[PDB]
A paper describes a structure:
Central to the FNT family’s function are conserved histidine and threonine residues (H209 and T91 in E. coli FocA), both of which are essential for pH-dependent formate:H+ symport into fermenting E. coli cells. Here, we show the high-resolution structure of native E. coli FocA, together with the H209N variant, and describe the dynamic pore features that couple to the protonation state.
To identify if the FocA pentamer is inherently asymmetric and the observed flexibility at its cytoplasmic side is confined in the protomer, we further analyzed the cryo-EM data for native FocA without imposing any symmetry. The model reached a resolution of 2.87 Å (FSC = 0.143), with local resolution ranging from 2.7 to 3.1 Å. This calculation unambiguously confirms the 3D variability of the symmetric pentamer and shows that individual protomers have different degrees of resolvability for all regions identified to be of higher flexibility by the 3D variability analysis. The findings from the 3D variability analysis (A) were recapitulated within the asymmetric reconstruction, but regions with elevated flexibility exhibited asymmetric behavior. The N-terminal helix is clearly outlined at high resolution (1) but appears discontinuous in some regions (1′). However, it will be important to investigate in future studies how this asymmetry is influenced by the membrane environment. Such asymmetry can have various implications, which may include: (a) protomers working independently of each other in formate/formic acid translocation, as hypothesized previously; (b) allosteric communication due to distinct thermal fluctuations of side chains that may reach several kcal mol‒1 of entropic contributions; (c) modulating protein-protein interactions via conformational selection mechanisms.
Author numbering:
A (entry chain B), B (entry chain C), C (entry chain A), D (entry chain D), E (entry chain E): 10 to 281
Write the structure that this text describes.
Amino acid sequence: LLPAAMAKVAEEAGVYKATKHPLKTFYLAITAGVFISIAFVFYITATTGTGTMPFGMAKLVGGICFSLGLILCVVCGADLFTSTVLIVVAKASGRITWGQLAKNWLNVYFGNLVGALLFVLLMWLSGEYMTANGQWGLNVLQTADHKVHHTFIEAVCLGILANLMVCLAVWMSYSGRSLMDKAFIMVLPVAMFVASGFEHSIANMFMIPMGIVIRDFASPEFWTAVGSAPENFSHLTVMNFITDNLIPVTIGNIIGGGLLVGLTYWVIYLRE
Amino acid sequence: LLPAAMAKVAEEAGVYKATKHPLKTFYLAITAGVFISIAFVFYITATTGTGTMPFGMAKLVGGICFSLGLILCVVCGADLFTSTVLIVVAKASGRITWGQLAKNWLNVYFGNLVGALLFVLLMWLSGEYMTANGQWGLNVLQTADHKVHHTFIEAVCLGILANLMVCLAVWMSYSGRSLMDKAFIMVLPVAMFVASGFEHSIANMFMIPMGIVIRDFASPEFWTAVGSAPENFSHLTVMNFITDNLIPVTIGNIIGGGLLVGLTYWVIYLRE
Amino acid sequence: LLPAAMAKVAEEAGVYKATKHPLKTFYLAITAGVFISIAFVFYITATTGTGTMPFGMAKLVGGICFSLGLILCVVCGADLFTSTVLIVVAKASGRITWGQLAKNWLNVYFGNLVGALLFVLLMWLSGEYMTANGQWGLNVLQTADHKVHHTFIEAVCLGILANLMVCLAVWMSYSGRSLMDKAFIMVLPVAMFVASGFEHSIANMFMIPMGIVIRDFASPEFWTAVGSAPENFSHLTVMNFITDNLIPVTIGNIIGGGLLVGLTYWVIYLRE
Amino acid sequence: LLPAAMAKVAEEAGVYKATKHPLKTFYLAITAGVFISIAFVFYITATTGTGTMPFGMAKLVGGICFSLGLILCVVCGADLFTSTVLIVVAKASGRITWGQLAKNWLNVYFGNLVGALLFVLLMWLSGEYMTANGQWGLNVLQTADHKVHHTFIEAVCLGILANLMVCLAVWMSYSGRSLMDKAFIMVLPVAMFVASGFEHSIANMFMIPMGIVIRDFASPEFWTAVGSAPENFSHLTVMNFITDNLIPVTIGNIIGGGLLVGLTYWVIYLRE
Amino acid sequence: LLPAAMAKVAEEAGVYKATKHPLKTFYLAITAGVFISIAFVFYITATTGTGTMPFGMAKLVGGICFSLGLILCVVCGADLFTSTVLIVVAKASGRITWGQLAKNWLNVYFGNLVGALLFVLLMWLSGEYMTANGQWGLNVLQTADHKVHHTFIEAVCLGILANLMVCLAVWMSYSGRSLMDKAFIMVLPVAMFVASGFEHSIANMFMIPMGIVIRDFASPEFWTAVGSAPENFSHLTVMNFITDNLIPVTIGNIIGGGLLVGLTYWVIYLRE
């Protein structure tokens, strides 16, 4: 597709998604949350034990593994919060209403949260935090620990960049016609935002709660194996999650996805 | 293919499989079991001697080598037990009966068992357990050993995750139109389920019997080469396999493949 | 496409680019600068801590990661300065005048500058320079310092090489028709020009200003962690950048991209 | 292509191959042997100097490099002996006679042997055995040495496994319609058989004669370079090759390729 | 395309190239030489500092990097010498005369030499030999030194093997129709001949003269950094290059390209 055609199909997807039946949107958001949880589990598995490997190569491979979740979302038509920020193109064109925008945003947000929590529960019940002699759980705990130590502006900017990359991956997916065209065009754009450590709202909704669960309910054998204590991650709290991470990263995701990609492309190809 | 057409072709495949001749289904189940045995053998060869490599990269490469088996099943049209769980989509639409589904499931399960046992016999007769100064047999023994030390809930959840990933790979291949559309879209979902160590019934009924026979009839030279004894794998018995692994993993596979993918997508795209 | 058709579509791209509204070209140039800076951030991330890695393999991996930005430029229709030097094919045939080409070049250059500066600001606000205990900022500073120690002749020749490779990658994408035709054919040409350390104007006007910003506004904790001082990069000034690097590299880019690819292929396939 | 269409085109290819001109078949078999020797040369080049590297990664990369030769035979239409076992499908359908099967098999075998010997001569005259301070010749000698130490049952089973993998690589390439569809789908099945040490007749009639030639005619400088002696490979003999390796591996290839792939698919898709 | 259609399109390409205007052939030969020197610069950059990396993996990755030059030659239609040997198919069918083939070969040879020399000048004026602190120039010198120490028969056989691989890569690209089929089908055949150290005339035309330039005109700081002296490269002379390298390598290239690929396939698919 030509870029004007990509803008047109983006507008069509925006009007199509916002007018869907709300319960169908809720189930699709649940599946999208499960897909992002799957992608982050793959990222954690790939980066387990890579303390001796080069930092950049390990981050790049982990980001490549994380690209599976967005591929699943696009191919299966799941409703992902960061991917549905592009339906603001339809709002800017006047083809959907502000109320529809807000309702779809809230519905997809809640659905991704529910799916992420359900996959967190299923992930905990599988005993995966003890694989690699507990290095899996320690990897999750270290990932969730550094994600709550950022400032407000810093976290907002990381979210802006993360959803900018995600929305650029989704827009480049509109150009392709075949399955490989859509899938392979999102590998590098997603590996870019994951390897750089940009903050993703739905990914954080799986990582930080899973770290909290591991910290709260870890067996003594896990702490003996990893050589750590729960006192080392005392900042892994739900309130700290919402304050330090969730709100600024979600705001940054909204700003990035809406203003930087969708609105600029609507201005350039669709305002006239 | 769009997700609605994807659900439609999934319903078509579910109807087609249940209505095939029993002998054709049995033969294709045998071939699917052989394909999964081939994939896990490729995985074992790919993970030989990686005690020094990072855990994540080794598991990811081994999982990528495992994608060959599901690609073989999809391209050659063989009935894998986890893939035939997706005939529940046709069952939920009323196009097939409960008895047909049960007969097809039992036939495919028996065929998978026969194929896995035949490939176990072929692998034993080929002398492959002595590869890499016996490290191939060592890898087989340790892979089979940790598969029988999971609790019932843990094994059920691991099977749920494994068959969820496998059925997501199979469902996404419905979107593909050409050969490499189907092939390359399935590398990541299977590499994930292998790298994360999720328990798959069909791969288990190959490797756990493989490790059992290796432990039972290994030559003394192998034991001197590996620096081990049959005593350290004393729990690798057939009854231990059936109780600790086979039943919970099969139950988890059924639950995941049916409810999480098949019935969810039937509800979303085929309920009305 | 055959080479004659490739030259014809290059001609059409040259006239079509030179006839957009000036604001549209400015916006597309800004997005092109943002994409190239995304690619360069990916290059820094993928090559952080690769001091123990072989020089060539780390450079190649970073260059492959850098290919994301130019793929974004070609797929999304962004206006890159080194890619718009190919519109000289349209000028050589007389379908556009010298004034249109000069105005288009100035507009694209200024838009690229604005985009690179905005992305520099965004990456500074995110705190990315402290990644890997300051190794990310250290890699940024090392890359920026090495690029200002080239004399005029070597800088001009390196720009010639860089834009020759960029314009060859752009030219090869004209042959392809699908998205993966255009995507994969430009991975190796960009990876080779990044790995070999050729001087790209648009990449540099994001790289060096970011190094200047890091030098000026880094916290003393960063310097303590990296074991260096801001005095060790005293040559990273704006005027030194503009004189020793920007001007010769831009001149070399223009010469390479225009003469070596554009006018040469116009002579071969369009002069008769 | 669906599996029924794949079986149909397999039948058509089997009928076409058996009825071609004997001289054209001989020349195609010569080119196929040359292609297989090229693949094994690439394999040895890739796997030289990897004593310190993990067994799994080294074998997998060597197998990926081996994929080139099979793609050469498939795309160029060369007659590979293992691939021409699949023309037994035509025999089972009665569309060709037993004598046609025997004549085609003998012609392709002789042509493959002639091509392998010609490439052995060309590789010996090129002085490639001294690459990397003699590590190339040492790799050839060591890999050839271990291939003649297998018992008859081991050789038969290894040939069965190898040619099964090769014939499944060929069979799924029937599904593909594009050149790269046939190419990439065959990389994993060939890499699986190479990495797992499975025994291929055509590859062996190149390697073992190459090892014999290297042992017999190497200069003493090569021997001092490798730190070994020709006495260390006393079992690399022509008679030992023919007895312990060629006959059983060929028997295993015939049995596997005929019964397990061709006849199985004929039973499933062609008997009715 | 089928092998018969591939031979037909090879004949068409041979007829078309021989009947082009001499100046167009000269310009395309210059661009082809530039492309091949681009490939060799990529190969040198990728393999810089891989003295600790295994020999096989380093050579294979370098061959992956070298495949860029052939992609440029096939996609952009440039006249590269070993590729233009395949016009012997047209001569064998009688569609072109001996004189046309002779002038075409001479023109392509001279243009390739001119392009390689101009690009040697471009890289020497860029200071690339100082990359990686003298390791880039040292790598070029080491690559150039080993190529001029091969015997006449060894050089002829290396050229034969190299040109066989190039003509198989080109002849395999005829089947592919879009850009990505042609591009990807050539990476492995080129990586095979580059990793194995086979001798390519046009590649040597850039390699050895570049090493001569580095030896003659390098600053003494280069010699102190690399810890070597120009006395260690006394055999790197222009006359030495032409005698020991250029003539036998070109003879082997012609023999390979003519007899092995072009004439054999003409006999198989076009004589009768």
